[PDB]
Amino acid sequence: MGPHSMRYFETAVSRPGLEEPRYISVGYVDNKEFVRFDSDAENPRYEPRAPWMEQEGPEYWERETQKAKGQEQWFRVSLRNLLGYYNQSAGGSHTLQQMSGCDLGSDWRLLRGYLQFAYEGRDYIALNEDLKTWTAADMAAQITRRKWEQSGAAEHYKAYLEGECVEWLHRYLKNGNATLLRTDSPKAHVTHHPRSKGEVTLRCWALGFYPADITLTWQLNGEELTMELVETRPAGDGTFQKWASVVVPLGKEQNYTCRVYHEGLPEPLTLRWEPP
């Protein structure tokens, strides 16, 4: 659901001792992993994670692998600098993360560009929606902000986001078309769990759906109910699960309806408890 998107999520973790950091880069198209680079692999290289990426030839993989080797070194220098900014011990365990990417508009142009960093899992510095200014989250990030305002880092990332990001995303959507257009509709059912004090839990399940975007609602006699909702979770086969439950009075279960909204469905599913 929503605009097409591409993201690269990159992480470097320093390791205690003389051991160099672990660097992992994961690429996503429309929230599904499509490429991965891991420095801990026997032969570190970008690998296709979505099989439609095997439409790319050896030159693509070589160029992207060389780029990952450069990014890994940038993260290594950045981790060292951050030790100094926060006055931390040289042989410790620390994490630097980056998120970058683009959302496409109806003109196949950039709709929103994303470029931010975190240190120890907390916001560090981010490029604002204008792709011109920086948000430093803390006092150490002020050092980086001055350095990057002086180096013109924002212009550099704005050019990637408005150009390469958008163009490569369009290429991947064309190559992955046959897979990216596939939807798996949720299969839904309601389960009944008696409680004490004349109450019943009704649980509406949505299973085996793709993409992960979904809405589950409960209504009493057609009126919305504001319900326990678990976080969408992977089934382990590429599809997802979710459930929503309500506590209702015993004997009044038929007055409640669950509704499931998902893009694979020609229309929302409406269902209720079906006693055997």
């Binding site: 880069s25 940038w74 600098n81 960093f117 990057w148 880092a153 990637y160």
Partner: peptide
């Protein structure tokens, strides 16, 4: 195709 963060580190 991922970003190239360039020559200037944090």
């Amino acid at each position: 195709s991922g970003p190239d963060n360039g020559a200037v580190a944090v």
